[model samples]
Target chain A: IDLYYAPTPNGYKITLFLEEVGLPYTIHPIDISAGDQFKPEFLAIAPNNKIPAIVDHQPDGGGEAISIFESGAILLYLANKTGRFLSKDTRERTEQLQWLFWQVAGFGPMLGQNHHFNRYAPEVVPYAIKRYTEESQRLYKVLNTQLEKTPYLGGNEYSIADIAVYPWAKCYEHQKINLEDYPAVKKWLEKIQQRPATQAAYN
Target chain B: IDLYYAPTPNGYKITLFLEEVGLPYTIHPIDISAGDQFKPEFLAIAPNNKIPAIVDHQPDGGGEAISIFESGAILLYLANKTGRFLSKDTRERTEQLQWLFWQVAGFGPMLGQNHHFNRYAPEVVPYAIKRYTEESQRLYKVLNTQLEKTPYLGGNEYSIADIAVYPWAKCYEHQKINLEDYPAVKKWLEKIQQRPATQAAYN
Candidate 1:
């Protein structure tokens, strides 16, 4: 596997999954700050021009190297290929998939907005900051409530859904969210943080 | 099927799928502007507190109803249940899913930011408006470039990837994007627009 990676949250999702699954891979670093994503070669691999795409030299039922973009898609693909985190059972699969989609589509993006306004934006826009910060907190609360029910976002199992959201939650303080307000989320983060795979991925 | 819906872009995605697949559904109107999303009952269905959730009364294998939130998840769930728009072929399935994930995690969120800054923000934050508008157009160009290859986002077939992106593309003008600039996107949107299911969904 040739993993095009950056150290961003989205990038960490793949690293977390790969580490957890013990997939041997080579990393091709794309420096987003240096505008590496705009290069024609990388664009061929990822039309969306985002980091964390993969060229699987050895795909299941192998043919040519199958390249895929999108971190969420990458996670699911890896899970299905390895038969690890993703459940085949309909109920369990749906449970994890919805939460995975939630992180990809909602938690990650909205929290990214909070990061942009709080840290990366060229200038401070109070309204945008407040809007996204409030949204980030709200999304965190939703996760907390879910974790209140089960050990992981997808349910009892520490599926891809947990891996997907864990990296983003690591940035809670930067998003101006106090995890103390959401104890369940805080504990969830700590539990994942203690995992050897997660430690290695972050390192 | 019970669809907790509003007429927003995200909301239309589910309706578009339900219509395309010819699934009979009861609509539970969620007037987001009226703070209906914050209600306890609705939150139980969608803890993320968003519109376009579903309670599938006829789940696969004749089990109890499965309630799913997030438009992307709902689309995939319905597709897999009916085995209609989503392909079983690995390459094609991966192709469509990456794009589907792209729409959910990147395309829709970025375009939504464009809408918020342009239309809904209390004070005109020129910086944010410029930021997201630029991102929106960039994302559209990515779509346009991809469509130049295949008739649909995934491949030859019109899968959930197309369904997910079509509704968001319908608001191109609102995002300050001129479809004329992205001819492929223009043609693609027009193609889906002509579909009876799409027309019925928007109607």
Candidate 2:
């Protein structure tokens, strides 16, 4: 398997997952900085032309390797293929799906837009930044509230939902959120962050 | 259940899903034209202030209802609670989750920006419009390729992946894509369009 990575939050989510799963893979760094992601080859690999696409060359029928894009999609593909992190039971699996959807649809975009308008954009638009940042903060509260009840997003067991989610939660800590208020979420973050796989892959 | 809805593609995805699933619910329309989502009560429901939230009045033990925001999140919540269109098998289920994430993370935002810049923004920013519209078109092609390979996103099963994705495909048609160019997607769209649930939900 080959993983293309960048240092962005989305990028690290996959690498962190790969390391946690102990999947053997090669990394091709598509530097988002030097306009490399927009090049024809990268565009060929990903139609959306985003980072965190992969080619699994493990040979289904010896045809060209299947390439998958969208970090959330890739995470699911890996989880399904390996049958790790996600539960074998139906109810547990559904809960995992629930929170996985929560991250991809909820926290990722909100925080991405927050980073865009807050730090990366050429102009400082207060409305745009506040809108996204406040949304990001609110999403954090939602996750914090949920984590207060369960040790992990998928209950007692740590699953792909936790792997898919905690990267952005880590970002909030980097942005200086009041972790004291979200004690459960903070502990949850620490638990995942302290995992040896996360330590290895995130760097 | 109370469904807070608007007429946007994401909102329509839920309304259409609920309609398809044949759920008993009332639509509390949040007029985006008037910025009603930002109002205090609505914000209490959805701090992100986006449309298509839901309040299910079934209590756990006490008489308190469960509130969920984010159209994608609500879709997953309803799918699990009802066990209607979502798959039961682990691999198929995760595939459903992955495609649902693709819609939320990739297609929804890209096409949304495409619509905004192409049709609604105060100033016509060609670069922005072209960037998003072209990206939207690329996403359409990706869907086209996927549909070409499988009868539905989750293989022969028409699951929530199809439910989550088809509305955005419908939006592309409304935007005047020559769907003829994407024959497989065109057929897939037509097939899903003919369903009683799609018709009833859309109506």
Best by DockQ: 1
Compared with the true structure, what per-residue lDDT tens digits does model 1 show for residues A117-172?
A: 87655355777887887888789888999999998886888999999999999998
- Clash pairs of candidate 1? none
Q: State the lDDT at B115 in candidate 2.
A: 65
Candidate 1 C-alpha lDDT tens digits along B1-203: 99999999999988889899898999999999999999999988888889889998888768888889989898889998889999998889999999999999999999988887776653568778878878988998899999999999969988999999998999887887988999999899989999999989987
lDDT of 2 by residue, A5-64 (tens): 788788888888788888899999998888888898886666556888888887334565
lDDT of 1: 0.90
Question: What TM-score do all the candidates reach, one by one?
Answer: 0.97, 0.71
Off by over 4 Å in 1: A120-123, B120-123
Model 1 chain A worst lDDT run, 10 consecutive residues: A118-127
lDDT, residue B89, model 1: 86
Error of 2 at A11 (Å): 2.1
True contacts reproduced, candidate 1: 0.93
